[PDB]
Design a protein around this ligand. Structure first.
Ligand SMILES: O=C(O)/C=C/C(=O)O
Ligand SMILES: O=C(O)/C=C/C(=O)O
Ligand SMILES: O=C(O)/C=C/C(=O)O
Ligand SMILES: O=C(O)/C=C/C(=O)O
Ligand SMILES: O=C(O)/C=C/C(=O)O
Ligand SMILES: O=C(O)/C=C/C(=O)O
Ligand SMILES: O=C(O)/C=C/C(=O)O
Ligand code: NA
Ligand code: NA
Ligand code: NA
Ligand code: NA
Lengths: 497, 497, 497, 497
């Protein structure tokens, strides 16, 4: 059946990235189900390590490892088996009492912290991947809009002329720093707490480095209390999500204002807009508002997690609040949605230029010209130009129609004196494109300057992608090593022992 | 007059670090007054840079720079002069209209963002210094308590034997990672947005690198929109404060429980306790609870800042919530207080050992011994030992009095079968010190293992202090370079122009 | 299969209320699925009202109403039909184009706000019911513990003697005020926004009172903008949940400390405790910590909702954050759990009395006796008694062994003078039960005073239950009236038109 | 000296209400200094009550009461005397040891909770007064704009025609419910905890009702634990502030969008706008953004307070976070500012009408007319009118120029069939004023309907003011009774004893 929301001005299908905003809530796993497959990997890595340490024989190890595959399969459809003690009991019912030996030297506490880290680790790479895709859309969009003159706003008022490319490279710089935040967090998430057992380690001679390496961790959470009590990485994950999403909310809000009926300086692609069941004229920025909704919602986990940490001791505690799958899923959906919003955004170039030329954002350049040309101080020139604007608005004179006569009157009105500048001086100062070209320093909207930022961002994106590929490959390599090791044990036992 | 709170069991004076918790609220500056001296430095750096760029003559520069000193002096007692436009107007009244030229190419927006960064930069070094002092107290305390056997808790229940040194090194590892968070944040705070002007740069040929260098920044916030709209570093500063303080709350809570009348395993130094105006018996953990109060309060700025960022566009906005001096001051007071709390904490070594030996935290080692000795699986041994405990509690038998007869009865009761272990096996398994010695892996409480962590932490603290000294010296060097440059201009003009 | 967590000291089954804490997360509905059945009721009420208004004929109404039952049935298994436009389209495919007439004068905006209110209304009655059950457990528990002498704490230090009944009646008074908060909120939730349509009403002659009455609302959200933009009730619902749960967290924390191995003044019923997979001695307060977890998590929705309201205009907005089913479900589970925790809590009466008699909580009465008997001011008596305690602790003298000689020495040591009180005066002042009996004013722990509070609370609980029964019956009556009306239309059309 | 910010387009002085936003931060009292005068009242009320109870003689009472005046005077300039134990010690140094008797039966705990309640009580009446003034401005503004046709927005897109009066009465209804929230809170704040002493009452025969009555409380916090541990009213105060301010943020945001350069449908009074130090054209909505800033900041205390309550037991705790004066001061400043913003807002009536007539907000009425006139279902009419809009936008045809030919083409294009409506039918459906007049039900924008809401709101405002006058007079009466009683004691002792 058709998408019944695609009626009237909501033509065609929702963009896939837009549809993600509708699907993640019902599709989200519980934390228990999301972490369960990582627990299964931990069982295997732990058992392999115990085998290397001689705590388990190869025969016992093979029996357990084969059982783990069988219980994993049962648990694919039986959710009751996805927490540890039910899982262990099912393993015991499957292979016998040797099942219990897989917990030697181990706790639910270090198992759980490690499993959640593995989950968050994968979700952090998933997030970094999405943020990179978002930055790619932003920078690649900017590269096409070096000449798209438009006003920048401060305090929701037209400030000065820039370009759309200039604006998008602000977002790129924001995302560059959020990627740093996420990679910095990744180094703290990707630490293995296994071997802490309950909170104090164990007398069993575990090799904590081997379990860590088998599970793709880059290091250990060393202190055993820190290994089970430590939760700051969960709080930090929630925070970076929240602050990253606050910037995504701000872009969404920016574009929503751009695409108001009143601004009309940009239009959402049809595939990122919805309509109204009652008002046929609506082209609703539903992608933007649902993206903002996720940003706002991300405040929740951050506060809950920090509240729970403020409520306890420096202990393992079952009262700690988690970062849950549905929260991350919402971030990914919003990030994907805004990636497509940016990619497909349709700027109204003509109206953007009209506002820049007509609505007085060029008055700074008029002021700077008076200082540069006649040498008066900035504050006196400012007062003259403000009077130019006040008078211009009163007389209905758009900025690009301000001439020598109006400027001289304002100078005389505020100063008693004329001012020695030409009509050409004023014309060039009020030309919004010349406003852009004159702003040619580092980080300023002149095409040459924005292009330099794009080049730099393109080189940084290459490093972003390389960092992600390296982190991902390290995990894939370890997971394959673990699988090989499991198979070796099971098969050697079957054929030779 | 005497400290009227030092009555009854609140003997002697408050520790200075404890007193800090009482003073910071009334003493805290407003953000305006805290940032004002940095604005004054920015005026000088900006003016020097304009002079290098030939935008100001040396004569104009000298006149302004001399005026800045005069207005700074007026503003020391006249708070109305500490915001920019009143300050500029006072400068104009002091030296004449040339005062206005100091704003060429500049805005309140990039001035304010830069000034707040300079404030937060200094406050971040102040915070890093305090966190290092806190970690030093923790590690140096741990070094004296390698042999201080005591129980670790999970879920506020006695879990297993550790040592006080082992526990403190959990905190050290937490603080190591919070110092990473803060240094990572410092690299983002210490970026100069000057030259962004209103939000789009300027046509004036500023040298943004020179202003940045004169003000001790390590780099630029490049994009001019990012330079004025960017606020994530403020949110991040608030977050690291909050998460760092949540760990400080947890230690404070831990110690508060240790020092309850019922636990009695540690006692606060008198200089960190208060008493009651009514109940003469009270030795109140007032340092701890006021430290937790600050931790809880630090949630506030984090939420307000993120809320404000979620509420706007990617613009300069006057609606953004700030991180205020009093919030940082509270963190410093709480950190200093807990530094002294830890340094002077008096553990009850005898009672710590008593609990470890008597209240069943050794049962894991009993369980592990059954697995290691008779080869049963962990789950069956666990069930036997649980019955040992249940029976022991019922009969009023402390853990260190559990013997062969009680263990065999439990084995028979739960299994129908005895178990082939000796009274010596049980004795050694129940010896809490042997529990500690057996836990000799990485991050575990055995003195050799905790000592290894202390050695590592001591080497890391040397690097922490070196990083702080280098960051501080860089700022001091730049501030002196700026002062030299100002004096050169003023004096050259006075004597030679 | 057995509950694999019920091993060792976790004997028997989890209490049903305890199990609720494990089930609500996987069982929680999405908001869409939770609100859908209320949307179906709204369709019927709206259509009936349109029929009364002559906007629909009885024949059209019957056709639609019969279709609504058919689509409702499809939607029981097809989740795609639970949002409005897909539902309407399925209705159109089921009965023809007349399906579209059910939206005359209506929007998704007032439909959605009304449906969510109906959901929250039912969930608020569900919550009030649970809070009443919680208060009933607290008061009925208190009634059995008028004589259960124990210490009250301030700042986690023993303060003065009370009774367990006295403590529980603090919770009762807290819950009384939270029930007021919830009933006050109910009056704002139970207002009907239908008729606001998109945000400005409609030219169709709706009878907004009839739709409201058919749906059990007690009044209208009058202004049509307020009807769709209004969200404060959602924020308020989240807040009362959060503050109510913060008090539940505090009781859970209180009991957790009571039931520490070190306090040992209360023990959780086995059916509300868990154990450890590794440490056989653990009787873990898992009901308490998971209850606190829900309290902490409830901060999340409150902050997200308020953030979203701070981010928008006074408009209908799709960016607003919702209060979701799983959040309320968590509150109900925690409230039920703590209801059973309180009901089945096992106080250690002997140890409670021991602490009261031995650990110096009686020193206030000693101080008051010196003031009352010899007329010295409170501050000088306080200083004497503090010295009594200091000396007593040093000499290992429990409070109930403090005698005339020790009190006189302290008086002489601090004053140079003895004090004219008898050994009987001191004995009676240090008798913890006499401490309780002397505290006989309003709200104080004397059995006569606590009994008076219980009587009052029992009368208030009768009114709580009456208020809930009346609110519930009003909704049941309206729902039956609506069902009758639907059937009348369908059947009259089938048989007579 | 002149207000140096009143330059260029920032003409005249800041409105006084606008200036409040600049002054409250530096002017805010600490909580200690704000509560101190209430503590002094409590000392007097407590001492008077002790005198009535015969615990103090009239002679002792007079001596203390006279001393309280002397220490109060010292404390006006010596901030160290504003906490209890220093104050008591200064009283002792002033009148002798009898000073200590004023604490008989009392604690810092019930003193502090009571003093903070008295502070919050007065601040709640101050807040209710400001909210009433805000509602008065809103309703009185609405009364002048029954005919000010303009579009209402949903999702920041033009939705349907309303009037400015209609919009303002949404705010009135919001404020009516926030006033209910505040008055409901007032009944819980205005409860006296005195007599709880430390947390368990006292053996002294206090008359808790007399102290409560002398201090203007309407009832007791009965249970003595609740009297000192109870804090929910602080959380609730913070919440109502936050949710009330979120609605104020939304109006501020709404007006900010109205007053963008692009909407230009309203203009702030000059006295509520600022300008830029660099951009002479700026008329900045600084009142609005600083008002939103306060709304966002109010999230902070709410989260800190709730966090602290989630962190402790149901005890008196010094870790609880307070609601501080500066937070309330910010709310009052923002409320006053927005009161003046609303009062002096200048709507652009001509442009408001232009948008309503031209930008397609009338399309719903076109759709409803097709349903009403030719009997097609709403969904098919909707699809036709959407095509009308799509075509109209493509051809540059403003809504008020849509005619029969365009509607028939759309009908044929989407249906293959024309539609039997007249040019007059279409004209009347597209007349934005007729859109308003047709929306004549309860809460809809027709002048008759908005006038009815204004009449109701005016009657409700009379009751709001009466409730405030009654609450205020009750406190003034009690304060005068207390002063009379103090004077009677002091003077009777001086002249007759
Ligand atoms: O387009 C949507 O996602 C939802 C719209 C609505 O329910 O109003
Ligand atoms: O779907 C609706 O009924 C309305 C949507 C809107 O407000 O645009
Ligand atoms: O010792 C203090 O800081 C405060 C105590 C109190 O006011 O209760
Ligand atoms: O200072 C008091 O009155 C009480 C303090 C306490 O609760 O310990
Ligand atoms: O289940 C465990 O492994 C441990 C639980 C605990 O810390 O008590
Ligand atoms: O500092 C500014 O940008 C403006 C402040 C104001 O007008 O309040
Ligand atoms: O005061 C300024 O420099 C700029 C203000 C603005 O962004 O409008
Ligand atoms: Na971490
Ligand atoms: Na940043
Ligand atoms: Na409401
Ligand atoms: Na309350």
């Amino acid at each position: 059946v058709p998408d019944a929301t695609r009626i009237g001005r909501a033509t065609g299908a929702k963009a896939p990235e837009f549809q993600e905003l509708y699907d993640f809530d019902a599709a989200a796993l519980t934390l228990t189900s999301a972490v369960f497959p990582y627990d299964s990997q931990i069982h295997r890595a732990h058992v392999v390590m115990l085998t290397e340490q001689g705590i388990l024989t190869v025969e016992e190890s093979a029996t357990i490892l084969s059982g783990l595959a069988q219980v994993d399969e049962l648990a694919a459809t039986d959710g009751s088996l996805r927490t540890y003690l039910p899982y262990e009991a099912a393993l015991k019912r499957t292979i016998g009492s040797v099942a219990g030996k897989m917990h030697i030297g181990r706790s639910r506490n270090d198992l759980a912290n490690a499993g959640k880290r593995m989950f968050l680790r994968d979700q952090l790479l998933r997030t970094i991947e999405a943020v990179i895709g978002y930055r790619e859309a932003v920078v690649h969009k900017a590269a096409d809009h070096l000449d798209t003159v438009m006003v920048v706003y401060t305090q929701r008022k037209e400030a000065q002329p820039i370009t759309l490319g200039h604006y998008l490279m602000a977002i790129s710089e924001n995302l560059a720093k959020n990627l740093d935040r996420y990679r910095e967090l990744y180094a703290r998430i990707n630490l293995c707490p296994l071997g802490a057992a309950a909170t104090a380690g164990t007398g069993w001679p575990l090799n904590r480095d081997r379990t860590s390496a088998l599970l793709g961790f880059d290091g250990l959470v060393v202190n055993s209390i820190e290994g089970v009590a430590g939760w700051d990485h969960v709080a930090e994950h929630a925070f970076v999500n929240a602050v990253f999403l606050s910037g995504l909310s701000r872009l969404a809000s920016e574009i929503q204002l751009w695409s108001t009926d009143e601004y009309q300086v940009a239009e959402l692609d049809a595939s990122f807009a919805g309509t109204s069941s009652i008002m046929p004229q609506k082209k609703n920025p539903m992608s933007l508002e649902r993206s903002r909704k996720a940003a706002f919602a991300a405040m929740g986990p951050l506060v809950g997690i920090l509240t729970s940490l403020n409520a306890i001791e420096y202990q393992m505690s079952a009262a700690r609040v988690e970062l849950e799958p549905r929260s991350i899923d919402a971030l990914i959906a919003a990030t994907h949605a805004m990636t497509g919003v940016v990619r497909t955004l349709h700027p109204n170039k003509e109206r953007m230029r009209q506002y820049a030329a007509e609505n007085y954002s060029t008055m700074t350049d008029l002021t700077d010209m008076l200082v540069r040309r006649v040498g008066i101080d900035y504050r006196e020139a400012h007062e003259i130009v403000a009077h130019v604007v006040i008078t211009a608005i009163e007389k209905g004179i758009k900025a690009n129609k301000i001439g020598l006569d109006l400027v001289q009157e304002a100078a005389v009105a505020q100063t008693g004196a004329g001012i020695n500048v030409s009509a050409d001086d004023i014309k060039d100062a009020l030309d919004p494109w010349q406003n852009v070209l004159r702003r040619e320093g580092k980080g300023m909207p002149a095409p040459m300057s924005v292009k330099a930022s794009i080049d730099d961002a393109m080189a940084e994106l290459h490093k972003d992608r390389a960092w992600l590929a390296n982190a991902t490959q390290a995990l894939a390599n370890a997971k394959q090593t673990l699988a090989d090791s499991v198979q070796q044990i099971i098969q050697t036992d079957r054929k030779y022992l």
